[PDB]
Design a protein around this ligand. Structure first.
Ligand SMILES: [Ca+2]
Ligand SMILES: [Ca+2]
Ligand SMILES: [Ca+2]
Ligand SMILES: [Ca+2]
Ligand SMILES: [Ca+2]
Ligand SMILES: [Ca+2]
Ligand SMILES: [Ca+2]
Ligand SMILES: [Ca+2]
Ligand SMILES: [Ca+2]
Ligand SMILES: [Ca+2]
Ligand SMILES: [Ca+2]
Ligand SMILES: [Ca+2]
Ligand SMILES: [Ca+2]
Ligand SMILES: [Ca+2]
Ligand SMILES: [Ca+2]
Ligand SMILES: [Ca+2]
Ligand SMILES: [Ca+2]
Ligand SMILES: [Ca+2]
Ligand SMILES: [Ca+2]
Ligand SMILES: [Ca+2]
Ligand SMILES: [Ca+2]
Ligand SMILES: [Ca+2]
Ligand SMILES: [Ca+2]
Ligand SMILES: [Ca+2]
Ligand SMILES: [Fe+3]
Ligand SMILES: [Fe+3]
Ligand SMILES: [Fe+3]
Ligand SMILES: [Fe+3]
Ligand SMILES: [Fe+3]
Ligand SMILES: [Fe+3]
Ligand SMILES: [Fe+3]
Ligand SMILES: [Fe+3]
Ligand SMILES: [Fe+3]
Ligand SMILES: [Fe+3]
Ligand SMILES: [Fe+3]
Ligand SMILES: [Fe+3]
Ligand SMILES: [Fe+3]
Ligand SMILES: [Fe+3]
Ligand SMILES: [Fe+3]
Ligand SMILES: [Fe+3]
Ligand SMILES: [Fe+3]
Ligand SMILES: [Fe+3]
Ligand SMILES: [Fe+3]
Ligand SMILES: [Fe+3]
Ligand SMILES: [Fe+3]
Ligand SMILES: [Fe+3]
Ligand SMILES: [Fe+3]
Ligand SMILES: [Fe+3]
Ligand SMILES: [Fe+3]
Ligand SMILES: [Fe+3]
Ligand SMILES: [Fe+3]
Ligand SMILES: [Fe+3]
Ligand SMILES: [Fe+3]
Ligand SMILES: [Fe+3]
Ligand SMILES: [Fe+3]
Ligand SMILES: [Fe+3]
Lengths: 165, 165, 165, 165, 165, 165, 165, 165, 165, 165, 165, 165
């Protein structure tokens, strides 16, 4: 009977993480500030759209394997497992640092769910692989702002008041 | 100095209410069940899209009058003022009853914010009028399922196991 | 000289009937109530669009055969030949019953106009056949809500307060 | 209790006037004749589309504030308050004169409804302002054919058989 | 064996007439002059597109009933049966007069072909009815510039140097 | 040599099942009757389109691994393994019951084919997982009409003449 | 009472023939081989789309005149009246030969149904004429690959291993 | 008589300010230089499009209330009331500073015009509120590049040669 | 060093002339009056769009050859070389006369710039040829309203109060 | 005065050649037969569209330099200078041979017109270069069917009854 | 540490193979000759687009797992492992033979990479499965030109100068 | 005979340079890092698309003048004449510096080819002018990141670790 239970756990846990990212990307989209604010405003809206699409796919896969989906605000708050994004005006370097970490953590967790369910539910595993793909792409897109190169360490001093990020 | 403060209060309070409706319409979209489940699945997705558009407009009007916007999950939970939507599978008659009440309550509250800010911030008042317009349309769209007519009281007995809703 | 006169009579009579259906479908679209209100709201808007397209085609065919077209409100009222749709909130079962009858009556009348003009004006007859096609499709779409089947008479008791429609 | 009553009166009266304009613009579209017939055929179809959109918005605002909407042909005829458009072939100069007057009269009446309801129903007032905007634009578009200029009074003699319009 | 022969004759004769109209509408589109030049430039391009579509449909119906289609320039010139459009700059009133006559003549000829083939080839008759429909609409669109009305004979004096057309 | 043979068997068996569903969804689309007829008409057309897309993908994957694809009507009839849909007018409750069962059975069979071929042909397994995903979504969409909830068992009595489905 | 019976017979017989062509064109689309395989792959997909559209129109015309439509696989097999398309890889010359014959036979049969029903049901006759039009166009499109010309008999030897087709 | 005069003054003054912004945003779009040049190139083109749309709406509202609109270059130069944008290559930090100030000043002036005309011309007031909305959004979009945050003052030193902006 | 200088002079001079035409076409679009007002309203908006596109292309070609572009309002006023368009309501005949002259003058000037730069900067010459093409097309489109024909001198008396233009 | 005369001669001569190609490509499109009939049907429709676009551009450039354009059928026949395309069914190899020659001849003639007018009318020369570009591309597209390669002379024996083309 | 190393090796090796196919399909697209040149021109452009899409996806998956991507021309040349496509004009039969082999070889190599990485990186394995799917489809599309059938071996003699391919 | 030879040399040399830029822009798109990585990612994709379009146009112009086109990877490597882009992660300042130089060099070389061929092949010269236009625009778009202004030298210190670029 832990067939359905394992699939549900992986889908529901991924759903809540995506919804948390939905609210955080949108929050950063509105409030990000600094040299890169508009670049990140646009980039975060793209991430928001991709995350939102997969949140709907994950929720409906849960209904498809026969379980209701819990997307309520109390459930997002109850099932954090990750830091909250600060309120107020948000600096561009802070947004980059925040999602570099958040996307990496979410991607790692999905990666393990994939292995957990691939035996009993390869079609769910397939969907979670597609979520992992996009979250890891988004992680790269945040990582690349500070990626070291042969000619420049890209410390971020220029977007962080002269101090490395 | 309560110029900005009055506008911010009206915008932020509306923003949180819209985000609460975002999560509730999406929750009902996934989990609604019964004779009208597909009708409501489609209708709730339309509401979700309209609510989501105005949530972004409200948040950016707040940035435009010079204040950050708080769209975090903890803030949605902290600033409820309305019932939560039940978890689990949701009956069509329950969804109709829930949003008939929720949209009416949200619309009434926006209606009062409009009067509060129209003197100091008519452009914000204009945006909140547009939000009120759509929320009240959505209220009608839920109300109409049970609207009494000369030939039929439309008690809802047929979607509520033989009992009036 | 009754060449033009026969064509004009068939086109003008069809034009007025289409315009009457335009106003009735739109009236039902706004005011329909009950379990099927949203289903019928959507369906009636589709009918409205198809009826409106053919009303313009019929009027311009009348101009093309050399006669002015009378689409005035007084002419719609003067040339009824069919019941009026009730005012006020309209029950879903009442809307279905109303258009099941109205579309059947309009279709039968167009069907006879086709035979009347096919000899002297086959191109007008061709247009009226296309109108008959769509009106008869719409009749089916209303009829199907109450169509008897081997497993269920579909009396409509569920959308008509427990009583067969 | 005259809250709803004042809003309903303003919405319903505007709805009937828009529907009257719907039928008149379409009638003029089919039957207009003369040098400017095609120019006006195209222009009147644009007006028809804008008027039709606002007729639906007005009717659904009426449902949104809790009242049924009366869009029946008998109601258009009963609630005239304006001249009827002539039947038969219509001269271009006659169409221009007719709508120059009709749009001005309708716009003035909406303008007063706006003031009547802005206190109790600013969101309805907002919609009626948008209707007033388009009707007054359309009035200009008809007025401009005969607008006096420094170099030419534009009497219309050229579209009215040598006589000023 | 005169089954195919009757269909071919009707299709080929219609094809050549459409191709003649193709070249004449395009010629008038480029060279028309006067007050209505731009109105007619646009209108004639619309006619050109509709005529061109039916020319392809007629030619392929001929291939479908098993005969090659002759759309060569020498065949258009050889099979005139109608006046040629003048070269040089063309006055707006001259273009209106020309196509009022040409479309009427072409429409009458198609009308008779329809009756000739409807017994042996109703599907070809159906296509020729659709051609007749559009040609007669185009005739109206040219006729309407000079259509007499109760208030104005619309003699065309204003587009023809003070003289009735 | 049973590499190709195992892949072919899984692809061909899935192809025939999809084609059977193609014809059954289309049959139900035309003939469904009752309160939910239009809801199901629309929903079944969506299913038809998704099933049709995957039928083409499955057939071309079979050609891609080097085998011809058998999509003939005799093969659909020969390779049933599932009930036939009744002829005649079909009740809405009967359609829901029929596809709830059919989609579940087809999904289970695809699920096992996935495991059978994932070792020798993971790319075919990947395609069959995508088919399983959509069939299981469609199963949910039919299941949800009768899904039990805390407030309502949703027996279907209202769409099945007073009797539970 | 043989009014409905004659229309039903013509519509149902045409429906089954179209559905048979649906499956055969799709089968040929997947499996066709040789020099012209890709040309025919594309062409057959176009035919498939046109045939599929008319199959839906025919089925819904049957519902519109008040009869259920039988589109089940057993009915396609039971009501053959035409050869089956071979299974396995299909040569380009074989596909051309097959549909040249099949489309001609189907077109001839529809042609007679048109005459049978035109008196009692001209609107159905109109639809069947449109089906005949497209089937006869498709016949030409297959015929043209082997059409004799003054300079070349087009025997097909080049697509049929040196032997005339 | 100062009804029209007050509306005209508010519309014309807004029109000239929008046209001045049109030319300045386009000038900055072409000539902006530095780290943010491409970000601002894109952003300024978006502003240009929104400003251009409202310039046309304002001018046509002026025609709609019965007055000609003055959009000539001499009038833009004559009615400055704001600094001119420098010629030559423009630094990104200079563009941000320039429009942060310009949009704030224009927004404040429109805000007062709204109050001036809302009594006599609420529909004009409504349009000017929509202009104020977009100008204030654009002000935020320029302001955000230098917005102070808890972790970073965003002095702009990085886009202004090491010196705070 | 007069390589860049010759290209810059030709590009900048063309840019200013296009921007002057931008403002003049838009001014005429809003204020044109008389029989042809709507025809010219539409035509002038098309010209405005084409002129605006080439203004951006010319400005960016200037940046591409390494020089900043001066599109400021003071520069348009300073670099007139052509008459200003009158303010106030503008008669249709006056607009036609104005742009007939203005487009001819601008086209002639561009024509000479092309020859000046074709040796040192053929790619700039290529762009200026494309500008010349469109300006000369627009000149024709204004010229054609008064173009003499064999049957009618088209004096414009009908759009100019009985007097030749 | 031979400025205009040289431009007119080059434009008019090109216009007539394009119109001749219009009719010939369309004739070949309908009547082409053989193995490549459908390939050429599609390709010739693409050529037809490109040729038709440039025919309109050439004619309007003629109006733009101040001369009427002669696109009449008699002028196409009078100004041949090239062979006529045969009537009747046309073999694929014959169509390829025909346009290989025709496009080469037309391209060579345009090429010389370009040099003739480039001094006095570089903008016309620019347009004729664009026509030459497309005609020479089309020549390649016909040439390539018989282009010799290291491994195959591509004699065309397979599309020409065993004989080299 | 060979986690990343195994994924990188599989992604980079696939990337280089796709880029090699990009250049080869484009080369064949331009230079292919013979009876099938246009068929292959079109087909190869479709392959080019699909290959190009997956090349970008593979490169960005490499960035997503934390490694730079090497898409330089020297790397394509250095990492051949497959024959080069001949220069000069290319015969249709040669292109078919070339890609039949090349796509098969590339597909086999991707197939093995999938198994190599599926344990440590199932999301990368998922992407490589999608690449394998399209490459194997393209292989079929080239294979089908010479696929043996019961009625015809399809030796290719007709596209290869009388000799089997 | 050096007619074709001069055109071929100019086209082929331009083709190879464009293909080299294709691979370099795509390489920079994937691997660029630092503050401007996303700005350049987007900008480089736009350049890639424009370069790719002109590469196809240049190759097909070569086929149109009768010569095969060499777009093979070995030819790109053999015909360098320009530096290679570094492998590995690429800093934003390095990408800007690289393409500022590369686009300038390519543009200068095309500029000379234009003069070389304009006499014998003005249509090829026309195409190469269009390539020069876009390459020089792209050069500006890279140059502008470091363009000196009156208020800021834009040394790039902020994107290059504190050191001028
Ligand atoms: Ca770093
Ligand atoms: Ca910062
Ligand atoms: Ca009730
Ligand atoms: Ca229920
Ligand atoms: Ca019943
Ligand atoms: Ca009811
Ligand atoms: Ca006047
Ligand atoms: Ca008149
Ligand atoms: Ca008259
Ligand atoms: Ca005239
Ligand atoms: Ca149940
Ligand atoms: Ca039922
Ligand atoms: Ca033959
Ligand atoms: Ca063969
Ligand atoms: Ca700051
Ligand atoms: Ca700077
Ligand atoms: Ca004149
Ligand atoms: Ca005038
Ligand atoms: Ca050869
Ligand atoms: Ca042949
Ligand atoms: Ca073979
Ligand atoms: Ca060959
Ligand atoms: Ca610098
Ligand atoms: Ca850097
Ligand atoms: Fe959903
Ligand atoms: Fe999988
Ligand atoms: Fe936003
Ligand atoms: Fe307001
Ligand atoms: Fe508003
Ligand atoms: Fe508004
Ligand atoms: Fe119309
Ligand atoms: Fe007919
Ligand atoms: Fe018909
Ligand atoms: Fe028809
Ligand atoms: Fe509506
Ligand atoms: Fe308001
Ligand atoms: Fe065609
Ligand atoms: Fe018929
Ligand atoms: Fe397919
Ligand atoms: Fe997989
Ligand atoms: Fe259907
Ligand atoms: Fe008929
Ligand atoms: Fe405008
Ligand atoms: Fe307002
Ligand atoms: Fe630009
Ligand atoms: Fe040039
Ligand atoms: Fe044109
Ligand atoms: Fe040139
Ligand atoms: Fe050019
Ligand atoms: Fe060009
Ligand atoms: Fe990319
Ligand atoms: Fe997988
Ligand atoms: Fe997958
Ligand atoms: Fe997938
Ligand atoms: Fe290409
Ligand atoms: Fe040139």
């Amino acid at each position: 009977t832990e067939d359905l239970k394992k699939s549900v756990q992986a889908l529901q846990n991924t759903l809540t993480e995506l919804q948390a990212l939905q609210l955080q990307t949108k929050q950063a989209h509105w409030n990000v500030s600094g040299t890169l604010w508009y670049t990140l405003h646009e980039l975060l809206q793209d991430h928001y759209e991709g995350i939102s699409k997969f949140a709907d796919d994950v929720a409906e896969r849960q209904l498809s394997v026969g379980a209701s989906s819990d997307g309520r605000a109390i459930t997002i708050v109850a099932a954090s497992r990750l830091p909250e994004i600060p309120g107020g005006f948000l600096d561009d370097a802070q947004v980059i640092q925040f999602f570099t970490y958040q996307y990496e953590t979410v991607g790692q967790r999905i990666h393990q769910r994939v292995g957990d369910v691939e035996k009993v539910d390869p079609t769910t595993a397939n969907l979670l692989q597609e979520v992992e793909h996009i979250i890891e792409k988004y992680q790269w897109q945040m990582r690349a702002f500070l990626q070291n190169t042969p000619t420049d360490p890209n410390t971020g001093f220029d977007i962080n008041n002269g101090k490395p990020v």
